Structure 1
Amino acid sequence: SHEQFRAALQLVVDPGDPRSYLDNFIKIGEGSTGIVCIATVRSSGKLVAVKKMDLRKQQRRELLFNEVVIMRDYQHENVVEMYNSYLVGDELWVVMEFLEGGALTDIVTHTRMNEEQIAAVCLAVLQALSVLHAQGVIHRDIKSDSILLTHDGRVKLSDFGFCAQVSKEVPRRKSLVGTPYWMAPELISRLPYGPEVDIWSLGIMVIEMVDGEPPYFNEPPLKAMKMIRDNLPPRLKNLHKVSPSLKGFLDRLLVRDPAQRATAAELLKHPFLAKAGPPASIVPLMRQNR
């Protein structure tokens, strides 16, 4: 049953105990699939992040493979770097880069962002999504919560628990996964869907950065989901705070027809993204700076 998973892991993971070089573990967080900790590296004095998870008590064990097997070795400035993974008892530990700035979701709830800062975030996420989409990877869970910030103000994509690899021969997936408010129409349709569901989800994230919340966030998840499927492209509640430039950009992401919805490739050219400021424009927005 479970020790078949254990055995496959032992192919992948680096062997040996990461306690041979890691200590002063401290809990950051948790999102059901495991606990997450900060730990110090003895040899060098640096901090890392460590996701730990017991193999037996995982329920969508399938997904546990997807982060490790996909995320292992993708080189990208705007993606969260995995260092190693280890088998430690009946537990998988994954060691990652530690982003000091935390999630963007902390920022969008408390403050409102200007367009320079919005453009930067979008730029970073589109750079990363273009490559991931250039190698078959649909993230399938884009939202402010899965964006992390360095102290420099750099933006990196993470939280690949739900990602899926896709190819020339089977170019779509069926599986109903994601966060409701952020899921595309076709995904709730139970239709086959491609790497464009990232783009809709991104659009919903822009509405997060401008409004503070996504559409229908008052509703229950089941209500909101028919609403996104059935009804029109949702709209910015604060349309008046927003450029015609950004408004255009946004109208090319929230296309309900998937066919004519735009692409990381395409969107990387748009005039909206030339407003993007450097990493330093983002710093002030953080909790140490607020």
Structure 2
Amino acid sequence: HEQFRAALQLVVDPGDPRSYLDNFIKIGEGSTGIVCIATVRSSGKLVAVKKMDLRKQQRRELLFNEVVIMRDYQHENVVEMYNSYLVGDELWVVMEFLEGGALTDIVTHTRMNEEQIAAVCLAVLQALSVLHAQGVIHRDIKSDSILLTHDGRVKLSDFGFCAQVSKEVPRRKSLVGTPYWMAPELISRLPYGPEVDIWSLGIMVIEMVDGEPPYFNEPPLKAMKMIRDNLPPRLKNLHKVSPSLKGFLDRLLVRDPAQRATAAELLKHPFLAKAGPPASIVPLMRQNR
């Protein structure tokens, strides 16, 4: 720790955000710390701040990942990092604020139609081509990780559990990600590539279609056991999805990762043609219904 704080000091911006930020508000909680929002006194713009405790982590060297990998990264479809700091015993990551909030709130309250679902998927997949291109694996994809703007635009967040691969470190080995949405290989402790993200995406479609992931009402521990062992889960209500949507999902939920489609490929699948403008998501959002 003594040494690990010293390292993180050298990757983050020096100084204290409290100097420029006012009026902090907890708005959330992930598995590693909390999420606040805050106002920048000059200008008055809003920012989100992720705050993680250095002493309160399982596997902290993980904490290294977003700050190192995802600094200076930019995309229409990624939530932007501004800076990062250490505040006492915490890591603070200051990020772009998203008004629309999370997709979770939508999938758990309405029935996204096909057009809308495709629009989420294209947004996610655009993002994911470029990420994997660079050998970056998000490793915690799910509706939780999808954030919206006031006008319906989709951006991917929660890179706290992301990973880097290269020519020399080709695949990864650690159990991260979130259990219901984790991939078979990853559970079975295999080396894994980006392709794990693609599986997790599929589970997101089940989220979008059936309102929650497979094996949900189970204990987390047993769900993994199940996810590992059985056949690819399919929809509770099949009769409700287009053949377009099926074939597509059937490219995502593939147990053998070498045959599971690449985002690159998925960016072309006829389904996504159905996607509709950012403004077609708008009425799904809490403050409209």
Shift, 1:103, TM fit: 0.9
SS at match of 1:38: strand
Q: 2:107, 2:211 within 8 Å by CA — same for their partners in 1?
A: yes
Which stretch shifts more, 271-280 or 5-14?
5-14
3-state DSSP of counterpart to 1:12: coil
**Deviation digits for residues 127-179 of structure 1 (CA, Å, limit 9, x no counterpart):** 11111100011111111111111111111111111111001122111112211
Using structure 1 for the length normalisation, give the TM-score.
0.96
Question: Which deviates more from structure 2 when the two are superposed, residues 87-96 or residues 161-170?
Answer: 87-96
- Conservation of the 8 A alpha-carbon contact between 2:12 and 2:67: no
Question: Residues 175-196 of structure 1, C-alpha deviation per residue, up to 9 Å, x if partnerless?
Answer: 1221111111111111111111
* TM superposition shift of 1:272: 0.3
Q: Is the 8 A contact 2:140 2:159 kept in 1?
A: yes
Instruction: Verify the 8 A CA contact 2:161 2:177 in the aligned structure 1.
Output: yes
C-alpha deviation, 1:226, in angstroms: 2.4
Shift of 1:55: 2.3
How many angstroms does 1:121 deviate by? 0.5
TM-superposition CA deviations, 1:21-58 (whole Å, max 9, x none): 11011110112411211111111111001112332333
Shift of 1:10: 2.3
In the alignment, is the contact (CA less than 8 A) between 2:32 and 2:56 conserved in 1?
Answer: no
Shift of 1:279: 0.5
Are 2:106 and 2:285, in contact at CA under 8 Å, matched by a contact in 1? yes
Given the superposition, is the C-alpha separation of residues 57 and 72 from structure 1 closer, same or farther in structure 2, using an over 3 Å criterion?
A: same
Aligned pair in 2 of structure 1 residues 90, 219: CA closer, same or farther (>3 Å)?
A: closer
Percent identity over the alignment?
Answer: 100
- Cα distance in 2 for partners of 1:146, 1:11 equals 28
Q: Note the C-alpha offset of 1:16.
A: 2.2
Number of residue pairs the alignment of both structures matches: 289
- Which residue is equivalent to 1:43? 42
| Preserved contact between residue 107 and residue 207 of structure 2 (Cα < 8 Å) | yes
Q: Is the alpha carbon distance of 1:59 and 1:150 closer, same or farther for their aligned partners in structure 2, counting shifts above 3 Å?
A: same
Mapped contact 2:32–2:53 kept (Cα < 8 A): no
Q: Which secondary structure state, in structure 2, belongs to the residue aligned with residue 228 of structure 1?
A: helix
Superposition deviation, residue 86 in structure 1 = 1.7
Q: 3-state DSSP class of the match of 1:148?
A: strand
Flag the 1:192–1:157 CA change in 2: closer, same or farther, 3 A.
same
Where 1:35 maps in the other structure, the secondary structure is strand
Conserved 8 A contact 2:206-2:212: yes
- CA shift, 1:257, in A, is 1.1
Tell me the TM-score normalized by structure 2. Answer: 0.97
User: Cα distance, 1:118 vs. partner?
Assistant: 0.3
Q: 1:177 to 1:88 in 2, by over 3 A?
A: closer
Q: Using a 3 Å threshold, how does the CA distance of structure 1 residues 59 and 252 change in structure 2: closer, same or farther?
A: closer
Match of 1:54 in 2: 53
* Separation of aligned partners in 1, 2:175 and 2:32: 18
Unaligned residue ranges in structure 1 (runs of 5+)? none
Gaps of 5+ in 2: none
Q: Mean alpha-carbon deviation: is it higher for 273-282 or for 26-35?
A: 26-35
| CA distance 1:170–1:15, shift in 2 (3 Å) | closer
In 1: Cα distance, 2:192 partner to 2:12 partner: 32
Distance change (3 Å), C-alpha of 1:55 and 1:253 = same
